[PDB]
Amino acid sequence: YDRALSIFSPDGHIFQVEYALEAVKRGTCAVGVKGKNCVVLGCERRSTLKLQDTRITPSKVSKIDSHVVLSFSGLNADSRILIEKARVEAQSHRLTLEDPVTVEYLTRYVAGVQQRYTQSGGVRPFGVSTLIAGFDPRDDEPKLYQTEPSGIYSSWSAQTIGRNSKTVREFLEKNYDRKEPPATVEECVKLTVRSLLEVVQTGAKNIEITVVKPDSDIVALSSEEINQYVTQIEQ
Amino acid sequence: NDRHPLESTLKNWETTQRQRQMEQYRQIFGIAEPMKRTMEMEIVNRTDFNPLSTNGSIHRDILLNKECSIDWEDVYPGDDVHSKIEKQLGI
Amino acid sequence: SSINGGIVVAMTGKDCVAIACDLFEKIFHYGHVFLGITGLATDVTTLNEMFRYKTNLYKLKEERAIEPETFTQLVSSSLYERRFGPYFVGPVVAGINSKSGKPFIAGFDLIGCIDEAKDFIVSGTASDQLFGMCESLYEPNLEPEDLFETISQALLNAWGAVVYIIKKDEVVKRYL
Amino acid sequence: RATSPLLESDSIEKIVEIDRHIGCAMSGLTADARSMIEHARTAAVTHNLYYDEDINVESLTQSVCDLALRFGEGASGEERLMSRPFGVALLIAGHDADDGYQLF
Amino acid sequence: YDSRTTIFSPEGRLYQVEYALESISHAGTAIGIMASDGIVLAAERKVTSTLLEQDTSTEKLYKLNDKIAVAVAGLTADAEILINTARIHAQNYLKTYNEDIPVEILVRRLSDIKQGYTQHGGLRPFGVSFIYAGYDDRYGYQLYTSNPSGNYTGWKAISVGANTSAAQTLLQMDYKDDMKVDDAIELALKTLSKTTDSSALTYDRLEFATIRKEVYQKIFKPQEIKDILVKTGI
Amino acid sequence: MFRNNYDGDTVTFSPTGRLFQVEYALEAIKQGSVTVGLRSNTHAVLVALKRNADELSSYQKKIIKCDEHMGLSLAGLAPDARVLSNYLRQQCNYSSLVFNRKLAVERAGHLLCDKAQKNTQSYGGRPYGVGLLIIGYDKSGAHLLEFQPSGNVTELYGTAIGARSQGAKTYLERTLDTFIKIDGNPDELIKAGVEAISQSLRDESLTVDNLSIAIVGKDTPFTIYDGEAVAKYI
Amino acid sequence: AGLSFDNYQRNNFLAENSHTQPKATSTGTTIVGVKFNNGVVIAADKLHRISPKIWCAGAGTAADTEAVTQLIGSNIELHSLYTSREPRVVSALQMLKQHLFKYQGHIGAYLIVAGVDPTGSHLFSIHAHGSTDVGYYLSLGSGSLAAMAVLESHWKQDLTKEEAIKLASDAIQAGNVDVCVMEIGKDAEYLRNYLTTAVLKESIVNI
Amino acid sequence: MDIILGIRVQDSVILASSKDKTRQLSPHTLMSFAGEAGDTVQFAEYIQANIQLYSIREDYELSPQAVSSFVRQELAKSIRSRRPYQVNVLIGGYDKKKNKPELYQIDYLGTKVELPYGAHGYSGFYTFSLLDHHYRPDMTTEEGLDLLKLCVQELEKRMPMDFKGVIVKIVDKDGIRQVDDF
Amino acid sequence: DRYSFSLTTFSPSGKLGQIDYALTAVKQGVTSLGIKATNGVVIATEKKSSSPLAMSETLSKVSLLTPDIGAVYSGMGPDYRVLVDKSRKVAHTSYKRIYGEYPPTKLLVSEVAKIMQEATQSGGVRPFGVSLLIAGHDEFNGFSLYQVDPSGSYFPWKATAIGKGSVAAKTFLEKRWNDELELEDAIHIALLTLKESVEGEFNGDTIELAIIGDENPDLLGYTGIPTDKGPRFRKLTSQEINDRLEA
């Protein structure tokens, strides 16, 4: 039953797609948190060997437009190409329609692309689960969606993917109160840093952070070392 | 009216020529021969996928009996590999 | 616009070839073969880019610079492409063959019929008058400096003019 | 079926609308259901555009099951569209003046 | 779960790509180092015999464009087609934007190509891995490495092929970021000499290239290779 | 036992000289409910028993009209039933338009058997799993063509297909000398047809909601009875 | 692929405007081919090689006559190496007729093809759009009529190579001259030409 | 009426047009065009889409010269099989890599020139009677703006039609800047 | 059915099964060898006659791709024949009609290696079971002798021997080859070496030998316009093979 994509398992599963989703667990941890008005994405960068060139290709979290951010875990090679197709779609939408892509629309497109690469047995499904996030054009509501190799996608207040995901997700489940989500950017960043610290034993050098804000503002931090220290002081 | 007169006919010359040849063969040699030849052609095209080399299959030349001929369409021959995979599989 | 129709003239003497332009230059070089072009700005620019592309690919594949006769065949074949949609160009090619060492010059028509000659070539507006004034002004086996003087005078007897003097191992650009 | 409290219970649509008088509920692998719902909405809007009239629920159900039929030959001789049948089943609900409230 | 490249195994891993990663480990070592003022490529050619025409073979290194060079490991046949596609893409970019291709964009294209053949079931992964080297105004000198999996990574000094672990350890021990080309050459030659299975690693076994100083890309012929090898006194 | 080594696909024969894959398709009819048809010189009648999933659900359409002069009943696979019924309706309309001529019953039967047969020759496609009774009247008199998914089509005075149909077939064999001569009295012919299907039931009784009858003749365009209409025939 | 029409609309628009179309090169006035007892001679006011002993002279557009003749020459080279036997003229004629028919005469070629092959000597003519003719002596081009007049006023059976060359040259000049002679069992022979203001600023550009 | 004027100066590139007709391509490059409605604007927004796609992919804005080459190539591609439809373009920007402002003109046939100043439409011959005299490549941005003001004054002198007043867009090291109508 | 799983896939040890099997098939093939001399190249092979009733002439194992290039093989003959047809078509269409001159050995060998390689990784074709010696002369590179393997890997040589007699012939050449070999000694060395692998009759009908030497205007076929150089490829006849072998 696991030999092909086109055949259901007797209990109703499709073991090949489930194996692909398990392969998504191979990659490094990535997490995203929706604040009241800001979205924070953190990523566990693989511990860099001292011979790696830090000044080039440092970020896994990457941009799909001025107002959308994409993060992922799993097979990096597939992720780059999925991101490329997402960018192509975003600009095609900007061309055919005056308004930019709604984050919901972009995540639907990425889910469709992933699903389409599963419709036939001739192609391997992407071993990746993207964490598209951003703010809808001219709209203040933060949005955060997760995609899976099967094409199933859902919106989350906070979600984790990749290596040792369960530890982070359980921590967020306990510590994230939907009645009072972290409002200010600093609180959301501290929550993200705490969440990743439960998995990344290494210092702050491994934790990358991306903050996306309404009105098409995206910024990546290089000061979370202070945030890491504060959590250390709280620890 | 805006197109060059030779454009419409020459654009698909090879395929229409092959279709006419198959029609003649069906008239002379019955349904079996066109079936065999078209199935050879389709089983060669279907199995040969290689996006990088647009040059084309050798066996395609062998079966068309143009393994020793040259045409201007041969002298003067979204493009990413993945687009080609999508297009070829129709997925 | 005044930018189209610029004259191009090519001439050869002892152990050197001289190619000159009446002016955004219209004389372009790849490896050591020089290509002068006359015609529409779009066509000259596009042919420049396309020939740079093809000659760079040839150089990388062979690890050897392309020789003027091979380049002549390449340009003729390229111009035959779009035979039904020809470019509006009258290009002229010149250079020095590395191995045999003989200077080479050749003209073309818009479809790529190689109108080869080894005394001189002109193309563009006033081609007939320029041809007459060069025939009445040209002599064979000139020294490189005398060749430069002759070609400069020919253009002057047709501002902005650029003339290339190409030796075996050195090329001198000059503006007049 | 909120797997964790972090998921947005307000943004997982197991119930959706196909037309003003016609909606549906779904279950199973939602990926195929997305295509099924999109096809249903496309058919309904195309019918309203062409005939300037409301789509009968039975016609919409037939059209949807026709898409579901495509693991083999289609109802009109169309070639197979997919290697497997949908892992989705749904029940359509709507109203038609000639049929009243009915559930397929 | 290896007859097909399109299917994951229960452990969420591709056996076909891992076999390809094993394949390149059999090929001759290829090593690259970035200096403060230039890049140096060295490569030990696995194939060797007294009758082989060293003076013109140069199948272990390749040139893609002015100021961009790559060393390759694995199948030469597989290397050739990717090198050709890279040359076409670089020249096409130059024709379109009238600027030299930033090497990162080239590496992105080739990494996507190598991934792509891991995707379609009728296409096996490319059994090659490249060391990219080149110059661009974006970042100056930089070394990129790409595997059959279709991924790539930036490096200051890296080795590829047989005994890659030992060469990597030697580089990690000896490397410095302020080195210059004329010393990076000594480092690379020492690393290859201590990584090879040969007794002395004579000039015949070795193919070499460098980019330094607008920028001159030079691939050394065996005569100057011997001259340099005696210059460093192996 | 050995059957399991040769029934994997529609293409492979077995050393016994059989083709098990289409044999299974033929056997698939046994899962469907009984449907009966019978012939008379002036009239030909269908009788079918509709099955519903549960008491909460409506009953299925076992009888489909194609034109005012012919229609069909079916048993077996729902998807194949839909496909074949729609194809036959499309071709009947095509004949009626292109030729302005009502599609002959035998012509339709062979036109559909040709379609059914082709799928048994090619890999991937599966044999159809729907047995159906085409009934119609035209210039050549009344007809009733039994159909089987394996291209086999024959004209019968009457027959029963589906689960426990052999009892109805036995009753029809025992009354063939009788019900044929009932031409000119459609009520009596329908009563005979219903009395034929009654022998096929082991659990449930015929009722206005499950039973369904169709009749066609020179003076009667193809008509379908259901609901309270069939009460007088029960 | 092929001879792309990727500028036809632009060329028409430019022609409608002031931009003058540069003219294509012509191909002289006259052509003649004369068959004689042991060979055939083809003359023109340049000749095009199809195969060592298959030669063509082309009237009309020089670029087209060169391109088509050279393409069929390469194709016949492939054919000869394919069947490992000497190519023969009739194959060249069939290929030329089919080719110039395929493009419906928009390729402006009016060709004379002559050659010697295991079947002996051959001589033919191909007009645009495939209209073909065969004969002992032929002529094409604007000046072909006077050359013909000379030919039927002089040609006769059994004449030898010297008289063939004389007649061909006379027919051409009746319209320099270069003639090619094919002798059965011997190499074809191509007989060419048988009949202070300088204000200066200087710089060096890298090779 | 549709007209565009563009003047390169030592510090900036000044672009102006009659009312729109302008699209930004990057933080330091912008494009202005003329031509028949619909087709020209369609091409302009297509170019904007492609340039923004490249900028996002490489995460690095593109030099004005490369953008001009791309625009010329794409215009030659679009004209490949249709009537030329008479589009005219100007491209300006701050070549931040080489720290020099550059202004390029492109014409419907697909040519490109590194003009110090240019125009299309009615302004191709008038306002040259003034540019020929007043222009210099050494002046500051304010002098360039004053020269453009004098050019539009000359346009008003030559035109009895009620000229609408052009919008003025400037590009510097600070990126594209809009200037209130003047 | 719109795709076919690749016939060639990596073994767990990192090798390719079909490529190694094709190389083995090449090994079992009949011997063929070539030597690059100072002023020429020689390539020779044994004719694998099924019976003395076969015409030696039609077993043209060596065949010219261009007037400057000649190829000989070992292994699956029909694959070699089809590949030569494609290679000649490529040598014309891809290079000659664009650049107006026959391709040099390097570029043509690269193109043929490209044809062989795409066969290595495809859904419905096995790799070609041959390895070709491609000798030839270039206007710049001079004389060269390239070898191409089933996988498409190619690399030049001064001398080689592929097939059944590979190892012994290669070891013999390794001792006999020298820098200043004239062509008339390269032919001698090749004939002596081939004598080691030939069994049974060894004469002009059992060994096919071709040499890429000086221009031969006698083979050009037409005279005048001396700009065109005579073909350099030259097959030796059985009588001349016997003469060269007799001494």
Swiss-Prot record, chain A:
Pfam families named in the record: Proteasome, Proteasome_A_N
Miscellaneous comment in the UniProt entry for this protein: Present with 16800 molecules/cell in log phase SD medium.
Principal cellular location given in the protein's record: cytoplasm
SUPFAM superfamilies according to UniProt: N-terminal nucleophile aminohydrolases (Ntn hydrolases)
Modification type Phosphothreonine: residues: 57
Keyword Ligase: no
One Gene Ontology cellular component annotation held by this UniProt entry: mitochondrion
Organism: Saccharomyces cerevisiae (strain ATCC 204508 / S288c)
Signal peptide (residue range): none
Protein name stated in the entry: Proteasome subunit alpha type-4
UniProt-listed GO biological process terms: proteasomal ubiquitin-independent protein catabolic process; proteasome-mediated ubiquitin-dependent protein catabolic process
Compartments it resides in: Cytoplasm; Nucleus
Swiss-Prot record, chain D:
Protein family: Belongs to the peptidase T1A family.
Additional comment: Present with 17100 molecules/cell in log phase SD medium.
Protein origin, superkingdom: Eukaryota
Chain positions found as Phosphoserine: 4
Purpose of the protein: The proteasome degrades poly-ubiquitinated proteins in the cytoplasm and in the nucleus. It is essential for the regulated turnover of proteins and for the removal of misfolded proteins. The proteasome is a multicatalytic proteinase complex that is characterized by its ability to cleave peptides with Arg, Phe, Tyr, Leu, and Glu adjacent to the leaving group at neutral or slightly basic pH. It has an ATP-dependent proteolytic activity.
Modified residues (Phosphothreonine): 3
Subunit structure: The 26S proteasome consists of a 20S proteasome core and two 19S regulatory subunits. The 20S proteasome core is composed of 28 subunits that are arranged in four stacked rings, resulting in a barrel-shaped structure. The two end rings are each formed by seven alpha subunits, and the two central rings are each formed by seven beta subunits. The catalytic chamber with the active sites is on the inside of the barrel.
Compartments (UniProt record): Cytoplasm; Nucleus
Stated name of the protein: Proteasome subunit alpha type-5
Range within the parent protein: 53 to 156 of 260
Curated annotation (Swiss-Prot), chain F:
One of the GO biological process terms: proteasome-mediated ubiquitin-dependent protein catabolic process
Modification sites for Phosphoserine: 14
Residues annotated as signal peptide: none
Cross-link (Glycyl lysine isopeptide (Lys-Gly) (interchain with G-Cter in ubiquitin)): 191
Entry keywords, A to Z: Cytoplasm, Isopeptide bond, Nucleus, Phosphoprotein, Proteasome, Ubl conjugation
Described function: The proteasome degrades poly-ubiquitinated proteins in the cytoplasm and in the nucleus. It is essential for the regulated turnover of proteins and for the removal of misfolded proteins. The proteasome is a multicatalytic proteinase complex that is characterized by its ability to cleave peptides with Arg, Phe, Tyr, Leu, and Glu adjacent to the leaving group at neutral or slightly basic pH. It has an ATP-dependent proteolytic activity.
Additional note from the record: Present with 7210 molecules/cell in log phase SD medium.
Subunit details: The 26S proteasome consists of a 20S proteasome core and two 19S regulatory subunits. The 20S proteasome core is composed of 28 subunits that are arranged in four stacked rings, resulting in a barrel-shaped structure. The two end rings are each formed by seven alpha subunits, and the two central rings are each formed by seven beta subunits. The catalytic chamber with the active sites is on the inside of the barrel.
Name recorded for this polypeptide: Proteasome subunit alpha type-6
Organismal lineage: Eukaryota, Fungi, Dikarya, Ascomycota, Saccharomycotina
Encoding gene per record: PRE5
Swiss-Prot record, chain G:
Active site residues according to the UniProt entry: 29 (nucleophile)
Catalysed reactions listed for this entry: Cleavage of peptide bonds with very broad specificity
UniProt-listed PROSITE patterns: PROTEASOME_BETA_1, PROTEASOME_BETA_2
GO biological process, one term: proteasomal ubiquitin-independent protein catabolic process
Top EC class of this enzyme: hydrolase
Assembly, per entry: The 26S proteasome consists of a 20S proteasome core and two 19S regulatory subunits. The 20S proteasome core is composed of 28 subunits that are arranged in four stacked rings, resulting in a barrel-shaped structure. The two end rings are each formed by seven alpha subunits, and the two central rings are each formed by seven beta subunits. The catalytic chamber with the active sites is on the inside of the barrel.
PANTHER family according to UniProt: METALLOPROTEASE TLDD (PTHR32194), PROTEASOME SUBUNIT BETA TYPE-7 (PTHR32194:SF4)
Name of protein: Proteasome subunit beta type-2
Name of the encoding gene: PUP1
